[PDB]
Amino acid sequence: LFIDDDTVHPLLGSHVRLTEEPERHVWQGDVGTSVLSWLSDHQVHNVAALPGAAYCEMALAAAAEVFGEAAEVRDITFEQMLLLDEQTPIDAVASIDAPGVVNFTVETNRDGETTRHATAALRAAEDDCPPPGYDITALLQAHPHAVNGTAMRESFAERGVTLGAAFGGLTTAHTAEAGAATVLAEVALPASIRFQQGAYRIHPALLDACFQSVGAGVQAGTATGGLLLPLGVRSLRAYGPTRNARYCYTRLTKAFNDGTRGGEADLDVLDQHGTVLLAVRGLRMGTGTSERDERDRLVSERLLTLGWQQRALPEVGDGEAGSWLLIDTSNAVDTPDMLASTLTDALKSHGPQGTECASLSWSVQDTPPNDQAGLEKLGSQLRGRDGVVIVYGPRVGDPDEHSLLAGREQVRHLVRITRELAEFEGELPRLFVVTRQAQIVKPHDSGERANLEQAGLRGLLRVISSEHPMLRTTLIDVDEHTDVERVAQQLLSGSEEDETAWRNGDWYVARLTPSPLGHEERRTAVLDPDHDGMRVQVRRPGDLQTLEFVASDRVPPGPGQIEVAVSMSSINFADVLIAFGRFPIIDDREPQLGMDFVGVVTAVGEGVTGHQVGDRVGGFSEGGCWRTFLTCDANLAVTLPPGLTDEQAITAATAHATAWYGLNDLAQIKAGDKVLIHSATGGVGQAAISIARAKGAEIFATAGNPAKRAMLRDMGVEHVYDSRSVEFAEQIRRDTDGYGVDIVLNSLTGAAQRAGLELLAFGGRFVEIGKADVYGNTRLGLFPFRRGLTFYYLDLALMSVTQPDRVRELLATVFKLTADGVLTAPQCTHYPLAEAADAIRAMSNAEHTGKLVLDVPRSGRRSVAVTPEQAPLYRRDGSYIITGGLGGLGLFFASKLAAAGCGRIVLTARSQPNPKARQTIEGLRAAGADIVVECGNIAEPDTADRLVSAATATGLPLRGVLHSAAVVEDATLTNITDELIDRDWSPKVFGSWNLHRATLGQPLDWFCLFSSGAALLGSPGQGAYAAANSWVDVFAHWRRAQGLPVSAIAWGAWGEVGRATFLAEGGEIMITPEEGAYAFETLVRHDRAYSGYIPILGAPWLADLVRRSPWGEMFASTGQRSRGPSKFRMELLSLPQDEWAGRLRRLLVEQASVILRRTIDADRSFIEYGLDSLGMLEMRTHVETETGIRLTPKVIATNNTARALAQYLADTLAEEQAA
Amino acid sequence: YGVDIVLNSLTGAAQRAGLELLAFGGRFVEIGKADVYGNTRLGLFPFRRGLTFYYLDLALMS
């Protein structure tokens, strides 16, 4: 036992006055957890990351260093936050840019690159007037109803970031009202850290705590979902050492018009009165990403879809001593129960011990006079004994009109059967329902004729078994390969799950799964490049393997715009940059693949001459040149001269164009002068070699590995060196008799190029293409310029954008110089366009030699192309119709379609719209969209015939269609009237099937329908609508197998605590149409058949959604746990008083062992173990926190033994409980 | 829009700011002396606009 033995600003780490031009202040330090162990508390997603407050103190300290006192920092903004390792290298620099103006940024170099994290201005000393003060007592009076600080800590922790312990303060959050725009809090550093106040202007923990005060907001529901992070503040005004800082005051400027965005609050601090030590202005707090990104994440996590899991029979043969009874309830078919008889034989025989299985058959209902027979035979008397099985036959059925009519009455007879079983009071064994190809299953074998009559049986099964937790129903799907013997073996036990299936010779299980949108599932179309607009693109930056084809759509020739079908295209060096996402994307140009093209004119504009349709033409264009059809300006393109083939033109021009430009216009080669080319093996290098050889000048060159240097000798150029090295310059010096070079073309960076300038002699000319060095601002030392140098940077794209005429003249010039043969093509290393990934590798990895060329097969072909997000959603040339559009969601859809300027909009209200709906429709009609109303009942087939004929008779083809019917009741199965069944089914089915058969010829770009979220389980009462909803999903599968697009969406409001959410926020939600409108727009561009757009994990509906069905794919908790008020005391008082002694004795022993760091004996004194006054204080404070008993040393002295102390505490608890 | 051509003899922040003032493809010609011998740490970043640099001395050219 011994001591461990373990002035500079901590975060800055060191200061240096780099007093060059411009003058720069530089700081270098470390902020890892090894030094700042306290900083480890600030962790988001259990990952230690410093808050943005850390930069603010860094900026304040830097400004104080450079600006002296009265320092201030303006418009600080945060980049991506820093992940705190044990040690982390952090660097900050402040530089003078204008007289009296200094800009300051921070960054962290890593693995040869760097990432900036905060930028701010250091202009300060604006005024001498101290900021005015204000009455703290008046604010405190005006702000009652303060919220406990630890509650805010829990709120932040559950939102993703836990603050640990070192981030104390913010004891209470005082507010004026429920809509108060200003709050204040009492803030102070923890005792363990309070000593650190002498090393900061503002302690980072205290500042972050002040930021945490914003979490109170106008309401506790401010930014109800997700976590917010600060993005910096407009201005920061430090005016006093916060050594004595006690309270902080805020002003929520209510920039959160949505209640979530920005915040833009102002923070002040004070002490005991209207002191103002630090002022914070315009805090970008309610932030984190774009609202579009927020909605994308919300719809990603708010969408659900059932999932099917293959597995062996889980509980096969585990049942024993049962007595089954199989009843066929589908004997309207001639022989449905023949397969069920084997199930009875397997159940009766394979079952161990005296296991048996009776067999029965019956029509589903046949006639009303033969009702209640099932109840008497099984449901009331012969059940109870272990085993009940219900079979509906191996029937398959083409969903025609006859099948639809049969299925409606079939589900009616289903509810008739189930009603009697529900009404029975006795216990019922778990049911075994048998159906063939009717359960909703994975797209595997999700074809045609899938017996939709039997498809809707799911929706009611978990309504009867929700009021009766017993008889837990399990769905099984039958097929020819299901091997019914195994099924009955599974039926012999009945494993606890709801849905099972058989799409091959193996067993399946089904449960709900989260539904994030996939990318390979996107809409496709078999397109012909001969006439269909097609383009290539990358799915995500940084992954070249994600190259994919996308329908580029036809592009008619605009004003003065030419249209060209590509014959060939090349690969620019910038392509790999955009391919890997490291392209200089700052300019927000969103570049694509291809700056160059060659081909034949497809179409001609009106403001264009010279060029004409059919001309051989090549040129440069943006928007990506790797597309079948392209429309751009004529001046960007030049007619190919005769003899000059497109193949040679595309592979030679661009590199030759750049080289000739640099060597003829920027520099001017004088025959015999000395020029050097970096990486001559490159296409541009070969082009420059050709230009120089044409110009008859002395040539030096360099390249990579000796293989890349071999062809250089093969083309017969001397002075060949290794580009990867830097010693080439002095080698040239001695190889040029000490005299330097005249012109130099560089593709290198860093020390390589600066040596190049050092090699330049007198009137040297320097031309650079390297994107990296110029964009990195790693400025070259300009001392060698004294020789009289000229520096040029070249970007053909920039000139093309700004001076199309000049680049056009250059292209014509190089075309002529290639036609006459004075210029040689670099290489003909062609590669397939569809396999451009390996070309990207070859250029990026540079393992290849020479110029890489393409091959463009997509002149005319046939393949499936993934449609983009540009896919048609609104069309002037399109008719649209909605059923139930008078509903709020339908009203929003109509409003957005009219605002979008769609062609025609038809509506149906199942007899006629209500007067208010008619008034809203006529008000919206002034927008010009053809809004028309169709009468009749969707349940009537001729009404749908009208919807396909007369609605189309408005004058446009019908493309967008949707159905939006719904039920308005949640009564249990016993109360269901046939009127409700008819109104739920007949409109739905007579819309779906009739519009499917009656709209085949129409373009029909999309088709969607509404659904209920509980359709997988049924509402506690509603079973009929759930059954109806769990019928369209298979119908969607059936229609997709047919081919036409179809989709379905379940609808659910924002009931995270039920109805109380809306009453707490706005009282009225109409099932969240605003976010649904976004999803509806996305869902139009989606082909997924069915999905549940329902909130999850937040609603009380989660509890039943995870226990009603014993299945689970998402954990029903986020790991956040609450703490009971005096946890041990309540559970202790639950026990009888005699137990209390030992029960609290165990806790006393644990606490004493924690304090003393050693084991103890309850009957022995703490003093003999080493307890002291500090230990006594610790133990009594813990006791107060747990049992709230004022333990005092004289009590401790009398009860120095843990047993006696526990007995005294038990007696005290008994006395106070008696009181 | 900025300027197209700059003939500069100033030093330090003056030329630095003026160099930014150049428009796309601008021409910068330098005639002063202090900066070139001072190895001034200017900013290579604005060269994105396709700038061109020229250091001038009649004596050396002669």
Author numbering:
A (entry chain A): 876 to 881, 894 to 2106
B (entry chain B): 1626 to 1687
Please give me the paper's original passages concerning this structure.
We obtained a density map with 3.87 Å resolution from samples of the ACPs = KSs ( = indicates crosslink) dual crosslinked protein, complex A, including all domains KS, AT, DH, ΨKR, ER, KR, and ACP. Both ACPs are crosslinked at the homodimeric KS domains, linking Ser2060 in ACP with Cys177 in KS with the C16 acyl tail bound within the canonical KS substrate pocket. The crosslinkers tethered on the ACPA and ACPB through a 4’-phosphopantetheine (PPant) arm are well resolved within the KS • KS’ binding tunnels, each making a covalent linkage at the active site Cys residues (Cys177 in KS and KS’). The full MAS structure adopts a homodimeric architecture, comprising two catalytic chambers (chambers 1 and 2). The dimerization interface is comprised of the KS • KS’ (2566 Å2), DHA • DHB (429 Å2), and ERA • ERB (1165 Å2) domains. Supported by partial density, a 14 residue flexible KR-ACP linker (L5) allows the ACP to travel between the domains of each of the catalytic chambers of MAS. Due to the flexibility offered by the linker-based architecture, complex A is not perfectly symmetrical. Distances between the active site residues Tyr1912 (KR) and Ser623 (AT), as well as Tyr1912 (KR) and Ser2060 (ACP), are 78.1 Å and 71.9 Å, respectively, in protomer 1, compared with 72.4 Å and 69.6 Å inter-residue distances in protomer 2, revealing a significant in-plane tilting movement of the modifying compartment that pivots at the KS • KS’ core. The AT domain in complex A is in the apo form (without substrate in the active site), consisting of an α/β-hydrolase and ferredoxin subdomains, sharing a similar fold with other type I and type II systems. The absence of observed “turnstile closed” conformations in MAS complexes A and B implies that iterative type I PKSs utilize a different mechanism to prevent premature reloading of the KS domain.
